[PDB]
Amino acid sequence: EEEDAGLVAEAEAVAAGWMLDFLCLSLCRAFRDGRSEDFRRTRNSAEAIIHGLSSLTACQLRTIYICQFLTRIAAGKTLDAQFENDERITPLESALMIWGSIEKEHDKLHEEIQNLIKIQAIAVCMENGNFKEAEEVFERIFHMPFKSKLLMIISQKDTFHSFFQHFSYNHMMEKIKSYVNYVLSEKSSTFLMKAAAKVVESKR
Amino acid sequence: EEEDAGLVAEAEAVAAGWMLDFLCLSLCRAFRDGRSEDFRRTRNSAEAIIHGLSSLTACQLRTIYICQFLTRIAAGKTLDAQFENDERITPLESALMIWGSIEKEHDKLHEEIQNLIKIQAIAVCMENGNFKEAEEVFERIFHMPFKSKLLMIISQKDTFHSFFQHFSYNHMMEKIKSYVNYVLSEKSSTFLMKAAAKVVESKR
Numbered sequence: 001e002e003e004d005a006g007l008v009a010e011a012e013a014v015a016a017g018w019m020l021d022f023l024c025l026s027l028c029r030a031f032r033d034g035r036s037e038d039f040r041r042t043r044n045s046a047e048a049i050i051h052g053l054s055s056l057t058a059c060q061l062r063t064i065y066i067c068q069f070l071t072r073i074a075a076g077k078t079l080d081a082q083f084e085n086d087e088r089i090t091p092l093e094s095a096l097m098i099w100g101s102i103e104k105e106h107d108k109l110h111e112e113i114q115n116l117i118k119i120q121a122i123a124v125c126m127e128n129g130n131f132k133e134a135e136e137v138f139e140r141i142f143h144m145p146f147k148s149k150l151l152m153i154i155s156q157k158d159t160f161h162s163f164f165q166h167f168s169y170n171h172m173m174e175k176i177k178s179y180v181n182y183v184l185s186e187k188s189s190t191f192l193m194k195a196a197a198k199v200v201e202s203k204r
Numbered sequence: 205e206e207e208d209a210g211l212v213a214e215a216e217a218v219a220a221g222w223m224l225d226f227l228c229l230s231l232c233r234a235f236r237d238g239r240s241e242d243f244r245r246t247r248n249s250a251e252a253i254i255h256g257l258s259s260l261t262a263c264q265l266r267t268i269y270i271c272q273f274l275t276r277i278a279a280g281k282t283l284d285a286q287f288e289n290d291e292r293i294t295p296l297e298s299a300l301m302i303w304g305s306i307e308k309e310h311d312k313l314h315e316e317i318q319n320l321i322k323i324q325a326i327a328v329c330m331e332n333g334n335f336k337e338a339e340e341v342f343e344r345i346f347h348m349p350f351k352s353k354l355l356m357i358i359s360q361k362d363t364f365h366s367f368f369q370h371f372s373y374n375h376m377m378e379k380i381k382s383y384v385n386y387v388l389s390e391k392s393s394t395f396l397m398k399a400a401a402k403v404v405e406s407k408r
């Protein structure tokens with residue numbers, strides 16, 4: 001009669017999976033809408049739920065990587081945040097590692113977001129006056145003409161450069177929001193959200 | 205067309221309610237089984253989910269109070285834990301306040317658990333050698349003959365007293381576990397657990 005505790009542990013693993021998918025959808029939607037405090041509170045919930053899980057499918061792992069990517073991007077201007085065991089890695093550099101690791105299609109939007117994160121990883125350093133740090137970020141990350149324009153900007157110490165204006169933080173955020181909209185379309189059919197939406201719809 | 209964001213916020217509130225009921229059931233079951241680390245990880249999850257909730261029904265509030273009560277009881281021997289804004293209140297004193305506030309039937313088991321928490325609030329102090337603290341705990345909490353036996357034990361500084369053995373920490377834990385078993389029976393029918401159990405049962 002010890003099988004009952006096994007069947008309970010299995011059911012809690014099924015419920016945690018549904019809770020994880022739901023909290024990713026909620027986290028993605030909060031990032032898209034600019035709801036900063038809801039993103040902060042939902043990220044805390046997703047991390048806690050994840051610590052209570054032992055087995056993860058490939059889809060659940062991809063889902064977690066997307067949440068980690070959005071968390072780092074949000075923290076992109078927070079140079080005091082240490083997301084990696086190596087304490088020199090800045091938040092935008094950390095988001096770049098995850099963006100190159102996710103098992104996803106490498107379409108034009110993928111490469112545009114990647115290139116925007118690389119320009120901004122340097123620019124944010126420039127903006128805070130950490131010129132030597134921008135040079136170090138440049139070396140860890142690094143097209144050949146694209147590469148030489150950035151090195152010229154770091155050496156010239158011109159933090160407020162027109163190149164950065166052209167491929168702005170806002171530009172990087174809007175492109176990332178377009179991608180999040182495709183993830184939101186894919187996850188809107190998860191079990192928790194679907195059953196919650198039906199309850200709301202039945203009271204209308 | 206701003207109604208869609210309202211319907212989303214409503215559905216997330218419905219899903220959070222189901223997640224809360226599920227995490228209480230999981231937390232109660234972990235306490236009953238002696239699964240200390242699962243209790244610790246599930247408590248973290250319940251607190252996070254609760255911070256993402258604005259409206260609470262009376263049932264949800266009762267449910268949260270039971271989780272807070274079990275958390276304090278588990279931490280009953282941790283005299284370094286400060287659960288209240290008043291820093292002098294010990295964990296067992298804090299569990300006593302919640303046990304007297306929950307809207308529940310005051311049956312014989314209720315009063316037995318209450319009386320066991322009062323004896324142990326003092327005993328744990330005694331056991332660590334904080335005699336003046338046990339006297340202070342005694343004054344904040346305090347039957348007339350029952351009251352005088354305890355004061356005699358604090359004054360005599362006899363930490364290893366036979367009275368404490370008779371109404372032991374283990375005794376208090378077992379009685380609290382009987383109560384938790386009735387809560388587990390009531391909550392086993394919540395939506396998340398019920399739908400998770402069906403999925404596990406359909407794969408058998």
Ligand SMILES: COc1cc(COc2ccc(S(=O)(=O)O)c3ccccc23)cc(OC)c1
Pocket residue numbers: 043046047050051064065067068069071072083
């Ligand atoms: C492979 O995924 C994980 C996830 C965790 C715990 O979940 C998280 C940890 C850290 C972050 S953050 O990006 O650093 O803020 C998360 C962000 C969003 C969602 C979950 C996060 C742990 C783990 O290994 C210990 C692996």
Ligand SMILES: COc1cc(COc2ccc(S(=O)(=O)O)c3ccccc23)cc(OC)c1
Pocket residue numbers: 247250251254255268269271272273275276287
């Ligand atoms: C009325 O219930 C709440 C709950 C919270 C947040 O949830 C929790 C806070 C603290 C504890 S603990 O007992 O101190 O560890 C919890 C334990 C179990 C479950 C939830 C807990 C906050 C709140 O007001 C801010 C009111």
Ligand SMILES: [Ca+2]
Pocket residue numbers: 079080081
């Ligand atoms: Ca730094």
Ligand SMILES: [Ca+2]
Pocket residue numbers: 283284285
């Ligand atoms: Ca203390």
